Amino acid sequence: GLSDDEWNHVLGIWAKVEPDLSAHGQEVIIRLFQLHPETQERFAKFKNLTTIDALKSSEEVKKHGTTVLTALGRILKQKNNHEQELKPLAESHATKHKIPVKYLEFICEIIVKVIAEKHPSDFGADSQAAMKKALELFRNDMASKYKEFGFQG
Numbered sequence: 001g002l003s004d005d006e007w008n009h010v011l012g013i014w015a016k017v018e019p020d021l022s023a024h025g026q027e028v029i030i031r032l033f034q035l036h037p038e039t040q041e042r043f044a045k046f047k048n049l050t051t052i053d054a055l056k057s058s059e060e061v062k063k064h065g066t067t068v069l070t071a072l073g074r075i076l077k078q079k080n081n082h083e084q085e086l087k088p089l090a091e092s093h094a095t096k097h098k099i100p101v102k103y104l105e106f107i108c109e110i111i112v113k114v115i116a117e118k119h120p121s122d123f124g125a126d127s128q129a130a131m132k133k134a135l136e137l138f139r140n141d142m143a144s145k146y147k148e149f150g151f152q153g
């Protein structure tokens with residue numbers, strides 16, 4: 001996938017994200033639901049969190065956003081060989097939650113967005129290109145794994 005000098009850009013940011021992972025994680029979930037309300041339907045647990053304000057104030061939502069980013073970071077860190085980290089993610093998203101590859105792309109777009117919003121002097125063109133290509137490789141590999149579980153995407 002990526003060249004070392006892209007991974008360098010990816011890891012470069014990521015280090016700047018971890019100090020506030022929790023905050024980032026929650027903004028990504030809230031933004032997902034608010035820009036794409038269909039995704040909210042896949043979370044039985046957040047079903048009731050109807051207004052925005054009930055989202056901003058859920059500590060389940062923050063906890064789950066933190067969980068989403070944590071796994072991402074683990075996978076970004078393995079750089080190009082991240083199969084042992086993806087597999088369990090692919091399995092649950094395919095056989096359990098049943099998440100389309102399109103929703104995957106939706107969240108990847110927001111992750112990039114949230115980072116840019118939060119790190120204006122550091123998240124530049126180059127880093128943005130590289131981040132995208134990293135999330136794109138993740139999306140692909142997820143989609144591929146999905147097939148081994150009989151799920152389409």
Ligand code: HEM
Pocket residue numbers: 039040042043044045067068069071072088089092093097099103104107108
């Ligand atoms: C690429 C970003 C994503 C990552 C890194 C991520 C990862 C997480 C992790 C670590 C879990 C819990 C462990 C597991 O069940 O495997 C979680 C739960 C789950 N994920 Fe994701 N996820 C991704 C995107 C998506 C998207 C776009 C959706 C669609 C709305 C989604 C919906 C869910 C659901 C429904 C659960 C169940 C939560 C619960 O049991 O209440 N995920 N995911």
